[PDB]
Design a protein around this ligand. Structure first.
Ligand SMILES: [Cl-]
Ligand SMILES: [Cl-]
Lengths: 328, 328
């Protein structure tokens, strides 16, 4: 009876109903399958589960936060629809992506639809003008985080902007800022929005936001370690300097080792032997362990903020899962 | 001293300032050029001019409608950014499109940014929750209109959804519904939103909406005539059944003539001789004149609604221009 299974049982059916409800407003019958596709392919629903748990911890009630929970999961899926176009992703959750099944241009029409469904959910919250502003701010954060992650790549893009605006250097501080935007902001919002749905306590909302942000950063760092040590070397093959282990290593490596790691990342096609060489360079400065220590720092930060939230037992279990506490 | 020149002089600089203001909120310096590009390439700004004229006719003041005017022009440009991706358009307003200059995937990041700038403008209107709902409804209308226009094509798309969901038949009623969504709704909104910015009179807002809708339909029909009789045969080469002249003709042509016109539209590559044959088929049932008569019907409808709006002299001049009264 892990926490995600337990909360899926408790909240899952109402979350799915809410997603379909807002997407379905005004939806033409011959567009229905294409539009609902992205929310019918499965997914862990961690973000809306967090929203509802946060609302329940602070108020005893979760149902009032269903509109907010739909907002956060629809934003997640909006971002995925476009990310699949941008990265030409064929498969997600073990099934074809929207762009694969329907076409890239059809997926654009679907993505556009998702954002107006998000607005319908905003208008259904207890505080519509507040949520409207927070949604605009969070989507701009995600868009900016994605822009940065792409400009932190060393190769592999054909868009003139992505090549010409590529960053010359990517520091650890740059990496942390990028992941806070790309991954942290929406987890922060998931928690904060659960509180805002049921409470006017500004301190509690802010503690929730800070908890979710730190949790999201820890999650992303752990994911980055997995995306190096494993498919071994995934992020290396994808030329990413925006990877916690890579960013950590580039900060410690000597002149020629640093230069060599960057040479490998910039290879137009990264070979298996290049991957092992890059990993050896990362290991030569203990970058994997440094990354895990950084994740621990953010996990502990998340705990400090979470201690400010009452009746937080379920939130604590979620945290352990979101940040893959056990794995690390 | 035509009306557009006169209103550009009066309102133009404040409109441009507003567009940049909302886009600039939260905008990173190294993304600025890419994001502002679409509003720096020129354009007639007919929609925001209509918003401001409507506000001034009903209240004597236009400045209170600047947020609404920015909303309508940003929605216009949001739609163009994506339309350029979908149709792979290289040039617009005599300059490269966002997708051409920066790349298709960079243009997606820009399009996403535009929608949150729209939300910032919504939150700056006199009635934020009302405008928020109206924006969601209008963008869904435009998205649905675009979907329909594409499914009304006879050939020329590679997206599985666009091929497989292609409509078997496109009637005149289908055509009118599609243009009301794709072109009319945003012109309707431009006028209605000028009124909503300065007045709580529901009748005046509704008259404005109906005026703009009819104007937008008349405009689209005239544009469609131009896109057949001219570049002669543009919409025929693009396989469009969603063209007023084509829709009109398909309604009158006999069995074999109808079948032949549809054969030509479905040609994978439409040749010059195919164009002349199709035009001859259109002319054989007087479809061009029938289309112009249909535009006249919508223009006259627009006039009837406009008569309900006080101090409407400038609005009348705009109408004559929007619907290309002189040309037709
Ligand atoms: Cl409840
Ligand atoms: Cl004024």
């Amino acid at each position: 009876m892990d926490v995600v299974s337990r909360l899926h049982q408790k909240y899952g059916a109402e979350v799915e109903k809410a997603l379909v409800r807002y997407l379905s407003i005004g939806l033409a019958e011959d567009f229905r399958e294409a539009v609902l596709y992205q929310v019918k392919t499965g997914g862990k629903r961690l973000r809306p589960l967090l929203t509802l748990a946060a609302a329940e911890a602070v108020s005893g009630q979760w149902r009032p936060a269903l509109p907010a929970a739909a907002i956060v999961e629809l934003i997640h899926n909006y971002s995925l629809i476009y990310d699949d176009i941008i990265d030409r992703g064929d498969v997600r959750r073990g099934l074809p992506t929207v762009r694969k099944a329907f076409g890239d241009n059809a997926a654009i029409l679907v993505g556009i639809w998702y954002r107006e469904a998000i607005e319908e959910a905003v208008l259904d919250t207890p505080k519509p003008t507040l949520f409207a502003k927070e949604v605009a701010e969070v989507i701009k954060a995600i868009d900016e985080g994605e822009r940065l992650d792409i400009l932190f790549e060393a190769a592999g893009r054909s868009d003139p902007y992505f090549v010409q605006a590529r960053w010359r250097e990517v520091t650890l501080d740059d990496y942390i800022k990028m992941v806070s935007l790309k991954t942290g902001a929406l987890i922060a919002a998931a928690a904060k929005w659960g509180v805002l749905s049921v409470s006017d306590d500004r301190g509690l909302a802010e503690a929730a936001w800070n908890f979710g942000m730190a949790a999201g950063v820890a999650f992303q760092i752990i994911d980055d370690v997995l995306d190096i040590y494993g498919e071994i070397g995934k992020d290396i093959k994808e030329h990413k300097r925006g990877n916690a282990v890579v960013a950590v290593a580039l900060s410690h490596l000597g002149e020629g080792e640093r230069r060599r790691l960057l040479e490998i990342l910039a290879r137009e096609v990264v070979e298996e032997a290049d991957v092992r060489e890059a990993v050896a360079l990362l290991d030569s400065v203990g970058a994997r362990e440094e990354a895990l220590r950084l994740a621990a720092r953010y996990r502990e930060e998340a705990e400090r903020h979470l201690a400010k939230i009452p009746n937080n037992g379920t939130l604590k279990e979620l945290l352990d899962f979101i940040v893959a506490r056990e794995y690390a």
